[PDB]
Amino acid sequence: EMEKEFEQIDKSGSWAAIYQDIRHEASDFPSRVAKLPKNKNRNRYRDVSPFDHSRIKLHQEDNDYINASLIKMEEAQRSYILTQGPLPNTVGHFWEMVWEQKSRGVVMLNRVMEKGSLKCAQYWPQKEEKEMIFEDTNLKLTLISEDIKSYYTVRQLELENLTTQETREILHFHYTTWPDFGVPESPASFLNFLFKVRESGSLSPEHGPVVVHCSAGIGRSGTFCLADTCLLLMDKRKDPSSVDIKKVLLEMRKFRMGLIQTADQLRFSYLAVIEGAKFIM
Template identity: 95%
Template sequence: VKCAQYWPRKEEKEMFFEDTNLKLTLISEDIKSYYTVRQLELENPTTQETREILHFHYTTWPDFGVPESPASFLNFLFKVRESGSLGPGHGPVVVHCSAGIGRSGTFCLVDTCLLLMDKRKDPSSVDVKQVLLEMRKYRMGLIQTADQLRFSYLAVIEGAKFIMGDASVQEQWKELSNEDLDPPPEHAPPPPRPPKRTSEMHNGRMHEHPEFLPRQPGGEEEIRCSGSTAEE
């Protein structure tokens, strides 16, 4: 986990945050082969005000990588949607990974494109590249690698089948995702590390250069989109 452990583990059930005077309680935990859904209760002990939180944790999405398949990703995305968590009746959803632009950007880009397709009832009217450029105005560097961008296109194309009325694909996504299999062991090999950067002086100014690690199978370390570069 490349973030602070901000939710309680099953064995401890509760966490208390002294700086905010909030208590977080684990109500339930549903562990699938590649994601986990937790029901949490956030409480202010002083006012006794409580909030229910649904926590969707994609556990096998490698850092600087992509999910195993568009089917598994879309199965996860539609699980989140079916919960109502992305609906207008709830507060803004929080999507995060480690840097907040690669995996988070992929999730948000695919979801946004599918929402636009559904709203317009015309998948061909959605330009994925333009949607990404518009999103980058609010979160610089969204989508870090060529593989993530390629995967986003594949997921949008697959998701468009459902938007166009083929409801059977949702059941196919669930079957292909193998979500009911046992999850992988906790001590799986770590994801690849980001590249190191070196600096050098040129014309009196310091310039940084990435030192790319050996390329992962099928992976690319850099994408360029209308003059905007995102590197890992």
């Protein structure tokens, strides 16, 4: 049982050690498309690239490239798109991806500014009466409503395909209280947030995959998907304690590199699953 493994690693202070074995066992697949010179300004970080095998392709004939990966968890029957925080020049590609994949939710785990630097472009409207038009991808985005809570904000957005005049409602879930350094002290508000996403229908098989991002789309984004998938597998299985968080993480790392950036994010992921298991047993 993971709770006792938690006890052992914590008492022995073997978090980094565990983290390094995960790093060494992690898959390495080609990322040739990401490294083409015509795509250099589509990548926020030169060392964070989607693998070619799992990369999301845009349906535009010119350049299909976005820094986004499909993570397919076959036993849990859950998919996620993990992406970077859009850049000033990829906001239109971001919303084209949302459209093309039939996503119902966008999960944002960062602030636009952290540590005095921009981590993401402002890619959604701040006021109902000031909608955004992405001329490169022929999309219009309107803020419908905004519900601001202590730990997170939920926004209803209308995305319109200006080409076909079809519209969809997109939910934006914005976790606003992840600290600039380290991880939250308690997983309580992160679990609350994860249950609110689930309750919305955004993670359900009747929609395209949820879009999940932070700045790079590997650290906090990784923690979100890892906790969700582990708790779902504990619901599904005859024996809940058969769920090994290290194996799930390695299965998720076949689809996108570097998921869970620090030993502190790993320890936080265990804490989130262990605490969330109580509210599921």
